[model samples]
Target: ARPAFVNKLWSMVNDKSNEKFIHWSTSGESIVVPNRERFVQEVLPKYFKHSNFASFVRQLNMYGWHKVQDVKSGNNDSRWEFENERHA
Candidate 1:
């Protein structure tokens, strides 16, 4: 089921905004998440072989780790950009 949390990787990808960011954490790591549809359709099958994208998504939802297209900011900016002030 690919349940190992450490298996997670920070993939470099673009959000719906066409902005690239590091896709990490269950929380919003960027303006959007890695493409879940493509993930389910192409990625999981190619890698896990035993696991599929739809199944993984079901598990993710059952456990409350969900992904969406984008979550907007309240004001000043329409898109949310995660910033880490304490970084190199």
Candidate 2:
């Protein structure tokens, strides 16, 4: 569920269309807000009311699902690319 929530979070951040104040970096890159308040604090509490939420997050951390802000937009932000599945 954490991964799915993370995936949904990733999708929300990726599902935006850059307009007046924004736009994608282009190419294939993974861009995510990585804001825990909106995602974890607000959204997660809705369904994930347990300590396993932490475990799911730890699992996701293994996949390196961190955040990258738009202001620091470096290049192609087009994917939620997972680094690995080893739970590093």
Candidate 3:
């Protein structure tokens, strides 16, 4: 069961651009991109059609965590790094 706060936080992370950055760990131990909106809009919805706890967890495992490990292990940063400069 998903908590209301978790749902609300996900909704906010799904909607706003600035809010997405909050998910990134500043400690630099974990490598999470700041573009939550893109992850939510582009990556997730296509792969994870239904918005549920299980789907979310699967997405994190297959997508987020997997990519993070790749970056942290210095394998491939190109796939995970968000490019705001390209648009600008």
Backbone clashes, each candidate = 0, 4, 0
What is the Cα-based lDDT of residue 26 in candidate 3? 53
Displacement of residue 14 (Cα, Å) in model 3 is 10
Cα lDDT of all candidates, in order?
A: 0.39, 0.42, 0.43
Worst 10 residues of 1 by lDDT: 9-18
TM-score, predicted candidate 1 vs. hidden true structure: 0.34
lDDT by residue (tens digit), candidate 1, 38-81 = 44454444334567655654544554444443445432222222
List TM-scores for all candidates, in order.
0.34, 0.32, 0.27
Ranking by lDDT: 3, 2, 1
Any idea what lDDT model 1 has? 0.39
Better of 1 and 3 by TM-score: 1
Q: Top TM-score: which candidate number?
A: 1
* Tens-digit per-residue lDDT, 18-86, candidate 2: 121222334534433233333444444444567344564565566664433334544244322333333
Residue pair clashes in candidate 3: none
TM-score (C-alpha, index-matched) for candidate 2: 0.32
The order of the candidates by TM-score, greatest first, is 1, 2, 3
